[PDB]
Design a protein around this motif. Structure first.
Motif, PDB file in Angstrom:
ATOM      1  N   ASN C  16      51.571 -29.355  14.958  1.00  0.00           N
ATOM      2  CA  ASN C  16      51.831 -29.424  16.390  1.00  0.00           C
ATOM      3  C   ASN C  16      50.611 -29.037  17.219  1.00  0.00           C
ATOM      4  OD1 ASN C  16      51.962 -26.772  15.577  1.00  0.00           O
ATOM      5  ND2 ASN C  16      53.992 -26.369  16.450  1.00  0.00           N
ATOM      6  N   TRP C  17      49.415 -29.179  16.654  1.00  0.00           N
ATOM      7  CA  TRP C  17      48.171 -28.976  17.375  1.00  0.00           C
ATOM      8  C   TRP C  17      47.288 -30.197  17.161  1.00  0.00           C
ATOM      9  CZ3 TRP C  17      46.260 -25.187  20.660  1.00  0.00           C
ATOM     10  CH2 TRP C  17      47.059 -24.050  20.823  1.00  0.00           C
ATOM     11  N   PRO C  25      47.460 -27.818  22.553  1.00  0.00           N
ATOM     12  CA  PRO C  25      48.774 -28.118  21.975  1.00  0.00           C
ATOM     13  C   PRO C  25      49.285 -29.486  22.395  1.00  0.00           C
ATOM     14  CG  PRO C  25      49.016 -26.613  23.804  1.00  0.00           C
ATOM     15  CD  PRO C  25      47.537 -26.767  23.582  1.00  0.00           C
ATOM     16  N   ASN C  53      56.999 -31.822  18.398  1.00  0.00           N
ATOM     17  CA  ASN C  53      55.744 -32.223  19.028  1.00  0.00           C
ATOM     18  C   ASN C  53      54.682 -32.472  17.967  1.00  0.00           C
ATOM     19  OD1 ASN C  53      55.656 -29.568  18.300  1.00  0.00           O
ATOM     20  ND2 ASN C  53      54.928 -28.792  20.276  1.00  0.00           N
TER      21      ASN C  53
END
Ligand SMILES: CCCCCCCCCCCCC/C=C/[C@H](O)[C@H](N)CO
Ligand SMILES: CCCCCCCCCCCCC/C=C/[C@H](O)[C@H](N)CO
Ligand SMILES: *[C@@H]1O[C@H](CO)[C@@H](O)[C@H](O)[C@H]1NC(C)=O
Ligand SMILES: *[C@@H]1O[C@H](CO)[C@@H](O)[C@H](O)[C@H]1NC(C)=O
Ligand SMILES: *[C@@H]1O[C@H](CO)[C@@H](O)[C@H](O)[C@H]1NC(C)=O
Lengths: 191, 246, 293, 272, 44, 246, 272, 44, 48
Positions: C16-17, C25, C53
């Protein structure tokens, strides 16, 4: 000034036998001899000439070029060769009846042992960039292909393997413009 | 200053070292059709740089048991390049031709070739049958060999019932391997009609026949090719329509 | 290994990065009603789209990407540099400076330059490593020193190819590396655990392909197989696993057959066979194997 | 001639005797076969210029010549920083200048001085040119820095870079980058001929620089020399070197590990 | 447009002077004694 | 009337049967030093009959694995005859040179030689060491080979780091065994100083490199020598003193 | 003509045959009906100037062209900052220049460099122009920054903004902003024609910039490019774009969400 | 008032030259072959 | 699009209600025989 082209720059060759085009007696009626690009500012045989380095110091060139072949075989060995220049377009021609539609000269082995194929200026624009790579193929020049016209016939008690030395120069309409740095040296050892 | 020659037509050039004099067929140069002899009303096209150039055909290995080869010249360049494309789209055609036959060898080979042109070189069928349905006739690949060429079966009679000995009346040239390595003939337009279709009528045809056989000692080269170059001088085209192949 | 495709189209990761060191992010895939890729449009997967995400690839791009927050400076999307996203046979991207190249060998330029055409060009001349850059390049070579100019990031070398538009062909002055064994037609495999791809793996497999992959291990007890990627849309072309001792067939899998993900077989002379057809071709296989001594 | 060359309209020839494409290369001359004695050309009035390809427009580039370090410490200090004036220290201008045998020109030396971290603090420097035969300054407080009967330039770091013009001052009529001989008489050894190729006609003195102050200045400067050739004349053109340089005053190359002048191809019967 | 003006007594401190368009190429291309004609065989 | 030539300098003569045109280096004839360019005050001597003649060196057998040979020309005639004696006693020297390289073979041999001159032909050491004390430098017998000559180790780079291909800018001539058997170059005095010592400075040097290898069939002759003749045209000497050897 | 146009005194007509107000528009020509062939006018000597409406006075404006960021970090550093020379990055000068098909002009590029927070500290910059075909510098300490046979500008931040003049250097006879073709031969796909409209006659190299120092400089600069057209000639006038721009090298617009060329009214039978 | 003076050898580095007042509007307004008169019907 | 490569005239319906297509003489020989059948198709004229 004409300067020896390096047409045999392939692998499996040493230094001195790298400037010679081998000529033998082919059994089939028509075969393909050495071929190379016309672009002088491109990686290939033109890198070994003085005109190629001078065109490497600049970025755009114009005018006609001259490639001069020279037969260094025996006196009793005869034959005819077809040196054909083709304008840009498709890739290298596969056979001779396709390559003979461009600019070609029939050269026979006589007392004078050198022919000079002129490469005319058939470009759309005035100047061509020496880049000529990838998306720069817009500025390509064409392909010079050397074909066997009749054969390389040889009498008995005579070696049946000759060589052709290719030279190259520039005509009087040769023009250069926009000075830049060469790409033959990128790093250097501290002197 | 007679044995060297450089012929330049268009963007092609032919250099020579061992040459005889150039042959001009019937003493007439190939020119354009005058208004007095012409009969069509539409204006003909004249590229003069795109079809008038040296086209090089394939090479044929001259062996020891060779008979000879021949060609139909308005039919060999029927598919090769701008000339062939321009001849497929048009109905009328009129041009001369410039020829050059390359055959080199060493000073230890011997032999001789007879290269000549024959206007209206009609191929004859070979057989002894007189019935109309079984009388042998040559196929289309024999009458019109294309860009490849055709070989002789009985080269002593030129494959037409006419002896090869009497074929010296035609515009001819010899290739003697001790004298020269090339032969050059310039032939004008020879026909009983001003214009004509370059698809279903060949005006003349080249023939190469080795009179003296190729001989050499064991140790020399064995591949002797036969190369031919043709320049369609002073070409004209008329009657523009759809392109037809044959 | 997490990515068995040349563009990361199937990467179900927990990233998620955008980058682990020096990154921003990613945005969630359900709070993206502004953009045409969200979970309100694509339910039931469609590349992987839930309430996370993560760095996915739903549009068929050259690399997985997420939505970053727009800071009124243009870019609203960034490529994710996933360290564990590389097909076995992809060495990474490296820098290219000048006349001494990283790959000392033959070079080739074309307007239709995919990954497999360059791999085949370097393979038909018996070279060990392939390489391409800026979309139109094919650098062959056998030198072990191809990191002479430094290691480049994976997101930096995402220039699209010219023949295909779903593959990264290096970048401007940045060459991407590939070994020539990928996508080949048969080979003597003697490694401990390697991958075997179909003919023309980055492309779709050709019509009439037939070859024999051989795997020999000098003294292994039994070998373990796997099937990470399998996509066949036809029932005529099919894969087989055979033993060459008495020449009998072990298992026959085709498009209508779902192969098990893992099984053991007490053999040491397994040979792979792939008979293709000339009607329908979609994609190949990425069979991974493992031998325990 | 302000343009390159115009083309005459040509046509075809059908005749024996004239062979313009059979130029012999054994004579040592270049083939003079034009396009008009070949494939039919047209009338083109070329107006492409040839001014940029001249020698004065080709050697009118500065390039890097020398890099001089000046530490000016407190315990391991030297004070001065001399630099032998030679062009063979960097291979770009050396490769551009070693394509001729004899040259004669003027100079436009320019000095760009920066700090270690990079900063233009108002420190005044003194650039001294020591001709061959003059004593070299030994120390930042020496007697030679008086610059009586000696040219020197006083400039600060915040000022624009200094730029002086230098005339032709070789005792011979022209410079030379290749000297096939020995500088003096005597017996020459077989082991190490370290004096072979040395030309005393190129030693253009020494260039020194210090910091004008009283006590010290803990700053490591780094000066760069940019020399612009002008009014240049060259003789006897020489081919361009294809091997990497190894030394400054010697054109030594690697015996093994040779670099080919052209890269390798797939086959000879292949253009790409 | 005037760059032919010098500002010192010395002449080497000026800029590039008037360009010379001289181009003798025959001292490198044809360094032969017998002038080879354009339409002839170079050796007889 | 172009293939035959008889060069006469002094009491020597060179006749030829297979010759190309003579080469005049840079289009300038070798003449005497004018008063405008001269700098010495003492009057120079001019024998003009005792040093201006054809001196013939030794012959070298052209084998099949041959690389090439080279010479330092103001140093080869440093000990042979009146020219060498007159050059040992004097400090200054200025002359041109006339060259002739003989290499004959039959009409069944093939090969080509590149003979050319290089002003200031500096020999480069061969090695990959950059330390000043171990950097390889050529010996005195390698830099100045004397009347014997020296061979090449890497003739592709001319033993100087410059490619042989680009060496066609120099005054050169080819010896093609099917065309000619000799090469002739007339080079003037080329230096940046009017006079110079002919002992510790060689102005230029000849180099002969076989580009095409020597090939022949089993049965022909195998000893192919390479002979060179040099004529020191328009010689001048100044600064008479004791005779020094080297 | 230095003025616009004068008016001839007119009067009324009462006669048949002369119809100056019935100019047909189907012919493709513009109505040439003046005021004198209509309502009675007077004699006016107009002296309003037309000099400002010329092309050289219309394209003599600088405008913003390019914005180049240079971070020069310590751990995620790059050193250099290249910028492809193109005019399609900002829609003002693009809208002003895409109202013609073929143009030909010169340039007066100007570089305004500021810091992140905004401050003129005396840091010297190096602006390099890399022509198409030359290698790009890779690093703040690369080999290409020698600028031998390559033009470059050395200037500080406290100095006035640099300004150079650029000639016409396209290989064609004029520039073009609309190319209805393909750059090379071959088979063109149906899915994504990403090379359609690409003109190789407009790639004017790359522009690079670094900070001249030794170690580093923790400062994020931001350069702005201002290009003043001069000596401009235009051909084949093209209508002005009425849709918002979406890409740089492609005139793509929104299929849905179309912008009308004129705003809406209350009714057609109402002027306000 | 003098801005026609250049300071370099190159000509493109100058300022705006003498203004040209040429205005051909008929190549866009009336690109027709038959010249339509001012007092006449354009079609008959 | 195939028939428009020959000799054609665009005729619009206006006040004048008659067009006159001329058929040119594009024959190879001077005269054509009116036979034009079977093996006489050598003397055909074309198709309007
Ligand atoms: C006031 C400081 C001036 C600094 C420059 C020194 C002035 C003397 C420069 C002489 C110019 C010589 C240019 C090159 C000479 C020789 O060829 C080289 N030393 C050998 O490569
Ligand atoms: C010393 C730094 C100079 C910086 C400026 C670079 C000089 C070259 C500028 C060429 C001027 C080109 C103007 C526009 C060209 C093409 O139309 C655009 N690239 C396409 O929009
Ligand atoms: C990423 O996912 C991990 C799951 O363990 C979570 O702890 C972390 O807070 C997430 N970071 C962001 C920026 O969403
Ligand atoms: C998206 O999913 C996350 C995780 O389930 C949730 O926290 C968030 O509220 C969701 N956003 C919306 C708009 O539903
Ligand atoms: C096969 O055997 C191995 C033991 O090494 C085991 O780990 C694996 O799970 C077995 N496979 C199956 C399908 O049970």
């Amino acid at each position: 000034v004409e300067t020896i082209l390096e047409v045999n720059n392939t692998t499996e060759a040493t230094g001195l036998t790298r400037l010679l085009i081998p000529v033998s007696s082919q059994n089939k009626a028509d075969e393909l001899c050495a071929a190379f690009m016309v672009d002088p500012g491109r990686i290939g045989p033109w890198q070994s000439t003085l005109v190629g380095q001078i065109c490497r110091y600049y970025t755009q060139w114009s005018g006609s070029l001259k490639v001069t072949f020279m037969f260094t075989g025996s006196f009793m060995a005869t034959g005819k060769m077809l040196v054909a220049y083709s304008p840009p377009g498709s890739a290298q021609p596969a056979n001779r009846e396709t390559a003979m539609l461009g600019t070609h000269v029939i050269w026979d082995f006589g007392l004078q042992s050198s022919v000079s194929l002129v490469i005319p200026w058939i470009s759309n624009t005035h100047f061509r960039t020496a880049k000529t790579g990838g998306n720069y193929d817009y500025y390509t020049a064409g392909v010079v292909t050397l074909w066997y016209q009749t054969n390389y016939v040889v009498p008995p008690e005579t070696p049946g393997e000759a060589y052709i030395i290719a030279m190259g120069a520039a005509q009087d309409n040769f023009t250069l413009k926009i000075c830049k740095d060469t790409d033959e040296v990128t790093q250097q050892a501290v002197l | 200053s007679d044995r060297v020659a450089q012929l330049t037509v268009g963007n092609s050039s032919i250099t020579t070292q061992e040459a005889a004099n150039i042959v001009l067929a019937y003493g007439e140069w190939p020119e354009y059709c005058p208004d007095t002899d012409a009969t069509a009303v539409d204006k003909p096209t004249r590229p003069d740089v795109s079809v008038n150039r040296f086209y090089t055909l394939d090479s044929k290995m001259w062996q020891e048991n060779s008979t000879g080869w021949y060609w139909k010249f308005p039919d060999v360049l029927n598919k090769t390049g701008v000339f062939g494309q321009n001849a497929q789209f048009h109905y009328l055609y009129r041009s001369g031709f410039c020829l050059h036959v390359q055959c080199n060898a060493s000073k230890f080979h011997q032999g001789a070739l007879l290269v000549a042109v024959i206007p209206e070189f009609v191929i004859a069928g070979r057989g002894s049958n007189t019935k109309p349905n079984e009388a042998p006739h040559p196929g289309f690949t024999t009458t019109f060999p294309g860009t490849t060429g055709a070989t002789f079966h009985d080269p002593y009679v030129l494959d037409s019932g006419v002896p090869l000995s009497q074929a010296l009346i035609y515009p001819h040239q010899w290739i003697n391997l001790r004298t020269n390595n090339c032969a050059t003939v310039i032939v004008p337009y020879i026909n009983a009609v001003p214009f004509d279709s370059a698809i279903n009528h060949s005006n003349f045809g080249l023939i190469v026949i080795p009179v003296s056989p190729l001989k050499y000692s064991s140790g020399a080269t064995t591949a002797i090719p036969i190369t031919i170059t043709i320049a369609p001088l002073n070409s004209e085209f008329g009657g523009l329509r759809q392109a037809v192949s044959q | 290994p997490e990515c068995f495709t040349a563009n990361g189209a199937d990467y179900r990761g927990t990233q998620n990065w955008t980058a682990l060191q020096g990154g921003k992010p990613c945005l969630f895939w359900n709070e993206t009603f502004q953009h045409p890729y969200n979970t309100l449009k694509y339910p039931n997967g469609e590349g992987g789209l839930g309430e996370h995400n993560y760095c996915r690839n739903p549009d068929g791009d050259v690399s997985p990407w997420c939505y970053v927050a727009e800071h009124e400076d243009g870019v609203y999307w960034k490529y994710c540099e996933i360290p564990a996203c590389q097909m076995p046979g992809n060495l990474g991207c490296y820098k290219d400076h000048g006349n001494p190249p990283p790959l000392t060998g033959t070079s080739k330029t074309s307007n239709k330059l995919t990954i497999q055409t360059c791999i085949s060009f370097c393979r038909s001349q018996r070279f060990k490593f392939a390489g391409m850059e800026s979309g139109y390049a094919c650098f062959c070579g056998n030198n072990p020193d191809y990191w002479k100019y430094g290691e480049a990031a994976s997101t930096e070398c995402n220039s699209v190819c010219f023949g295909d538009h779903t593959q990264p062909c290096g970048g401007d002055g940045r060459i991407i590396l590939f070994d020539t064994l990928v996508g080949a037609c048969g080979g003597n495999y003697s490694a401990m655990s390697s991958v075997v791809y179909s003919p023309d793996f980055p492309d779709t497999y050709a019509t009439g392909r037939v070859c024999y992959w051989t795997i020999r291990v000098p003294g292994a007890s039994h070998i373990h197989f796997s099937f990470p990627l399998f996509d066949i849309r036809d029932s005529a072309d099919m894969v087989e696993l055979l033993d060459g001792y008495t020449h009998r067939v072990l298992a026959r899998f085709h498009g209508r057959s779902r192969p098990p993900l893992s099984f053991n077989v007490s053999l040491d002379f397994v040979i792979l066979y792939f008979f293709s057809d000339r009607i329908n071709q979609a994609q190949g296989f990425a069979v991974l194997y493992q031998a325990v001594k | 001639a302000e343009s390159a060359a115009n083309t005459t309209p040509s046509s075809h020839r059908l005749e024996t005797g004239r062979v313009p494409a059979l130029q012999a290369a054994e004579t040592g001359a270049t083939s003079n076969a034009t396009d008009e004695n070949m494939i039919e050309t047209r009338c083109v009035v070329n107006r492409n210029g040839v001014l940029e390809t001249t020698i004065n427009h080709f050697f009118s580039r500065s390039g890097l010549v020398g890099v001089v370090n000046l530490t000016d410490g407190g315990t391991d200090t030297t004070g001065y920083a001399t630099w032998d004036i030679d062009i063979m220290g960097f291979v770009q201008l050396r490769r551009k200048c070693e394509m001729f045998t004899y040259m004669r020109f003027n100079a436009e030396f320019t000095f760009v001085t920066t700090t270690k971290n990079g900063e233009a603090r108002p420190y005044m420097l003194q650039y001294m040119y020591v001709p061959p035969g003059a004593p070299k300054p030994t120390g930042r407080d020496a007697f030679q820095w008086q610059t009586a009967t000696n040219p020197s330039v006083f400039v600060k770091l915040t000022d624009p870079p200094a730029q002086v013009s230098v005339p032709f001052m070789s005792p011979a009529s022209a410079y030379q980058w290749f000297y096939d001989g020995y500088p003096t008489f005597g017996q020459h050894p077989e082991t190490s001929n370290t004096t072979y190729g040395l030309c005393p006609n190129n030693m253009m003195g020494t260039f020194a620089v210090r910091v004008v102050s009283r006590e010290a200045s803990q700053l490591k400067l780094q000066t760069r020399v940019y020399m612009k050739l002008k009014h240049v004349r060259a003789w006897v053109p020489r081919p361009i070197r294809s091997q990497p340089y190894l030394l400054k005053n010697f054109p030594n190359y690697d015996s093994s590990k040779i670099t080919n002048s052209a890269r390798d191809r797939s086959s000879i019967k292949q253009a790409n | 447009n005037f760059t032919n003006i010098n500002y010192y007594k010395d002449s080497y401190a000026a800029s590039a002077t008037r360009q010379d368009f001289t181009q003798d190429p025959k001292k490198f291309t044809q360094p032969v004694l017998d002038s080879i004609r354009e339409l002839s065989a170079p050796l007889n």
